[PDB]
RNA sequence: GGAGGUCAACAUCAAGAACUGUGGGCCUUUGCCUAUAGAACUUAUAACGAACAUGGUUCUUGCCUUUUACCAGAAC
RNA sequence: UUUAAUAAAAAAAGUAUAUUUUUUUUUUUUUUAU
């Protein structure tokens, strides 16, 4: 197969144009930022769980209960950080 | 049988102006496994006959060694025999 | 990374080894350059033939065939031999990587052989084996030196313009029906890098040997410089030149030899060497030995020739100091223009007689057999010399 | 009347996917639109020939002493 | 681990001239008688 190689024709070349393969040619502060964000996120996950359990089965009572849960868990994490 | 074989190897080796071309012709001959040491011996003995070293007889030996394990074991035998 | 240029006829590309990112081994064409302080290879200088030198060679082979009309086949073979020896001898290294020069060499040999064939009025391949053209001139053939029976690298023109791929596919150079191997001239000529490296250590050894001979006054030994009598780049044999004491005064001779092109019609191919000052820089005696082993020997040459019908006892009596006789007498006479070109077909009749079994053979491609008048010879087609 | 012919003449065979005839209307016959009757043979991995030669002119090359005779691609 | 294969002859009229790559140098230490 003419695979890009070879003469275009053997007419003006004075050869046969016989082409053949060559057998000789084979051959930190930012870490603390994400860990702080992970802890504050877990605390906020707790109060979103509270909102899901409350609203699943009183808007102001659920919002104030979530705010008091954020207050209690924020004080608890201020105590658990020291 | 030995002399006519040396003549065939020498005439292959003694046309073919590139090392890749002589390596193509000799790997196209597909000499049997027993006579590979004889072929390597004829190549080295012909390399001695000129007035200096040339990179022809190095290139053809490299293209022999990177073809198959048998040619490399022929050269590892021929270094000890030399 | 590449710094490149083009000196006398050479196109050179110097590339330092710290800019390669893989060090591979190379063929003849690459000179590897020496730091000379630490004696460590620090570059490679890749060689190739300039294009105007390729065109000069092509034009020279054109000028042979135009200038030589009625011109005694042996003389055409001799002119081809000189025009190829000068080429291969000047840029030795850089023939190898030059693709269009290999192509033009193939076309040049087939033009010279086609000249002999059209002289015989037959371009048929089977009448003309390599025995006709490539036997030496003492066995009867034309005596021409081959450089075309190699394989040309041919690999992927679209990527060869961009990458320098390598030699992945070979393609056929110049063949015949019977597969004789024919040696090329390039194996028999020593490349320039090797001969320069040899010349350094040879003239260094001569420096130490001469400077130790002038110590204890041994005053010389020609016996000592015998294997080193033909090394060296000024050729050690020219130190003991026949007349050196009058060649001590010839200064400015390379330029004097080069400027003979502007004041001489018949040029010279060897404008670069001067044998008195520089030696014999090349020798082609072993080529004529290896071609006779390439064609198979004197038996397989002489079964083509008409030697069997002569009845000499031995082939060794083919060799004599043969005097030309008639045409030697006739070339000096007062002789017409038309009558002088007739003299040059006297050697061609002898050449056509000697290879007449092979020319008038029977395994022909097309040809209507005719018979001579008062004999019984059937000659296939029509050759007028035979 | 029927079958047949290595018999003849005359039409016809390559094109908006392509034919002819007729009636009615519009333009002023040609042509356009509308309604109708028939279409053998050849054709879509396109052509009568499940086959396949040569000649001319102009370009582009190849053999290279010039013309025939040629090398091998293109257009008409 | 595998695959590419050009050519191929008849008739008529011609043609200037030189062209070349091929083999060691010869260099000898000795003067009869005191
Ligand atoms: Mg005339
Ligand atoms: Mg004329």
Curated annotation (Swiss-Prot), chain A:
Quaternary structure and partners: Associates with the NTC complex (or PRP19-associated complex), composed of at least CEF1, CLF1, ISY1, NTC20, SNT309, SYF1, SYF2, and PRP19.
Region feature (Interaction with PRP8): 28-64
Cellular compartments per GO CC: cytoplasm; Prp19 complex; U2-type spliceosomal complex
GO BP term, example: mRNA splicing, via spliceosome
Additional facts recorded: Present with 556 molecules/cell in log phase SD medium.
Family: Belongs to the CWC21 family.
Domain CWF21 residue range list: 35-76
Coiled-coil segments on the chain, per record: 35-69
Predominant location category: cytoplasm
Keyword Membrane on entry: no
Name of the gene encoding the protein in the UniProt record: CWC21
Functional note: Involved in pre-mRNA splicing. May function at or prior to the first catalytic step of splicing at the catalytic center of the spliceosome, together with ISY1. May do so by stabilizing the catalytic center or the position of the RNA substrate.
Subcellular localization, as worded in the UniProt entry: Cytoplasm; Nucleus
Sequence ranges of Polar residues compositional bias: 11-26
Signal sequence region: none
Name assigned to this protein: Pre-mRNA-splicing factor CWC21
Keywords: Coiled coil, Cytoplasm, mRNA processing, mRNA splicing, Nucleus, Spliceosome
Residues represented out of the complete protein: 2 to 115 of 135
Organism for this UniProt entry: Saccharomyces cerevisiae (strain ATCC 204508 / S288c) (Baker's yeast)
Classification of source organism: Eukaryota, Fungi, Dikarya, Ascomycota, Saccharomycotina
From Swiss-Prot, chain B:
Localisation: Cytoplasm; Nucleus
Residue ranges constituting the MI domain according to the UniProt record: 4-82
UniProt feature coiled coil, ranges: none
Additional remarks: Present with 3260 molecules/cell in log phase SD medium.
Subunit composition and interactions: Belongs to the CWC complex (or CEF1-associated complex), a spliceosome subcomplex composed of the U2, U5 and U6 snRNAs and at least BUD13, BUD31, BRR2, CDC40, CEF1, CLF1, CUS1, CWC2, CWC15, CWC21, CWC22, CWC23, CWC24, CWC25, CWC27, ECM2, HSH155, IST3, ISY1, LEA1, MSL1, NTC20, PRP8, PRP9, PRP11, PRP19, PRP21, PRP22, PRP45, PRP46, SLU7, SMB1, SMD1, SMD2, SMD3, SMX2, SMX3, SNT309, SNU114, SPP2, SYF1, SYF2, RSE1 and YJU2.
Function: May be involved in pre-mRNA splicing.
Similarity comment: Belongs to the CWC22 family.
Name this polypeptide is given: Pre-mRNA-splicing factor CWC22
Gene transcribed to yield this protein: CWC22
Swiss-Prot record, chain C:
Note: Present with 468 molecules/cell in log phase SD medium.
Cysteine disulfide links: none
Subunit structure: Component of the U4/U6-U5 tri-snRNP complex composed of the U4, U6 and U5 snRNAs and at least PRP3, PRP4, PRP6, PRP8, PRP18, PRP31, PRP38, SNU13, SNU23, SNU66, SNU114, SPP381, SMB1, SMD1, SMD2, SMD3, SMX2, SMX3, LSM2, LSM3, LSM4, LSM5, LSM6, LSM7, LSM8, BRR2 and DIB1.
Chain intervals for the UniProt region annotation (Linker): 121-386
Gene field: PRP8
Transmembrane segments: none
Protein's name according to its UniProt entry: Pre-mRNA-splicing factor 8
Function comment: Functions as a scaffold that mediates the ordered assembly of spliceosomal proteins and snRNAs. Required for association of BRR2 with the spliceosomal U5 snRNP, and the subsequent assembly of the U4/U6-U5 tri-snRNP complex. Functions as a scaffold that positions spliceosomal U2, U5 and U6 snRNAs at splice sites on pre-mRNA substrates, so that splicing can occur. Interacts with both the 5' and the 3' splice site, as well as the branch region. Has a role in branch site-3' splice site selection. Associates with the branch site-3' splice 3'-exon region. Also has a role in cell cycle.
Portion of the full sequence shown: 1256 to 1641 of 2413
Domain free text: The MPN (JAB/Mov34) domain has structural similarity with deubiquitinating enzymes, but lacks the residues that would bind the catalytic metal ion.
Coiled-coil residue windows: none
């Amino acid at each position: 197969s003419y695979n890009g190689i070879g003469l275009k024709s053997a007419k003006g070349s004075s050869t046969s144009g016989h082409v053949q393969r060559s057998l000789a040619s084979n051959n930190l502060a930012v870490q603390k930022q994400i860990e702080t964000h992970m802890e504050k996120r877990e605390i906020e996950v707790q109060v979103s769980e509270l909102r899901d359990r409350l609203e699943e089965e009183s808007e102001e009572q659920i919002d104030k209960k979530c705010e008091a849960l954020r207050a209690k868990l924020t004080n608890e994490w201020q105590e658990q950080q020291r | 049988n030995d002399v006519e074989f040396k003549k065939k190897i020498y005439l292959v080796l003694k046309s073919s102006l590139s090392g890749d071309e002589a390596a193509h012709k000799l790997l196209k001959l597909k000499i049997a496994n027993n006579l590979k040491k004889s072929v390597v011996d004829i190549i080295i003995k012909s390399s001695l006959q000129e007035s200096t070293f040339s990179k022809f007889y190095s290139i053809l030996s490299e293209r022999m060694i990177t073809f198959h394990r048998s040619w490399q074991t022929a050269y590892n035998e021929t270094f000890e025999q030399n | 990374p590449n710094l490149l240029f083009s000196m006398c006829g050479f196109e050179v590309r110097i590339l330092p080894r710290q800019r390669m990112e893989e060090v591979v081994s190379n063929d003849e064409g690459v000179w590897d350059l020496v730091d000379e302080r630490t004696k460590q290879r620090t570059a490679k200088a890749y060689l190739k033939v300039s294009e105007e030198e390729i065109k000069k060679f092509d034009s020279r082979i054109r000028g042979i065939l135009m200038a030589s009309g009625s011109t005694t086949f042996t003389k055409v073979a001799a002119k081809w031999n000189t025009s190829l020896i000068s080429l291969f001898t000047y840029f030795r290294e850089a023939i190898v990587a030059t693709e269009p020069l290999l192509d033009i060499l193939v076309k040049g040999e087939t033009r010279i052989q086609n000249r002999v064939k059209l002289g015989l009025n037959s371009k048929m391949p089977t009448r003309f084996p390599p025995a006709v053209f490539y036997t030496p001139k003492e066995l009867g053939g034309l005596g021409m030196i081959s450089a075309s029976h190699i394989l040309i690298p041919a690999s992927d023109l679209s990527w060869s313009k961009q990458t320098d791929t390598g030699i992945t596919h070979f393609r056929a150079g110049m063949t015949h029906e019977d597969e004789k191997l024919i040696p090329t001239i390039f194996r028999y000529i020593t490349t320039w890098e090797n001969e320069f490296l040899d010349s350094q250590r040879v003239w260094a050894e001569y420096a130490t040997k001469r400077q130790e001979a002038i110590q204890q006054n041994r005053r010389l030994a020609f016996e000592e410089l015998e294997g080193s009598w033909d090394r060296g780049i000024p050729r050690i044999s020219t130190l003991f030149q026949r007349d050196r004491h009058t060649l001590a005064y010839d200064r400015g001779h390379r330029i004097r030899r080069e400027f003979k092109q502007y004041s001489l019609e018949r040029n010279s191919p060897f404008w670069w060497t001067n044998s008195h000052h520089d030696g014999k820089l090349w020798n082609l005696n072993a080529y004529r030995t290896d071609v006779i082993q390439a064609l198979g020997g004197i038996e397989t040459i002489l079964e083509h020739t008409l030697f069997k019908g002569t009845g000499f006892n031995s082939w060794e009596g083919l060799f004599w100091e043969k005097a030309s006789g008639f045409e030697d007498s006739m070339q000096f006479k007062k002789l017409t223009h038309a009558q002088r070109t007739g003299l040059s077909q006297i050697p061609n009749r002898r050449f056509t007689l000697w290879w007449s079994p092979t020319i008038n053979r029977a395994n022909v491609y097309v040809g209507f057999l005719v018979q001579l008048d008062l004999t019984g010879i059937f000659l296939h087609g029509k050759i007028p010399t035979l």
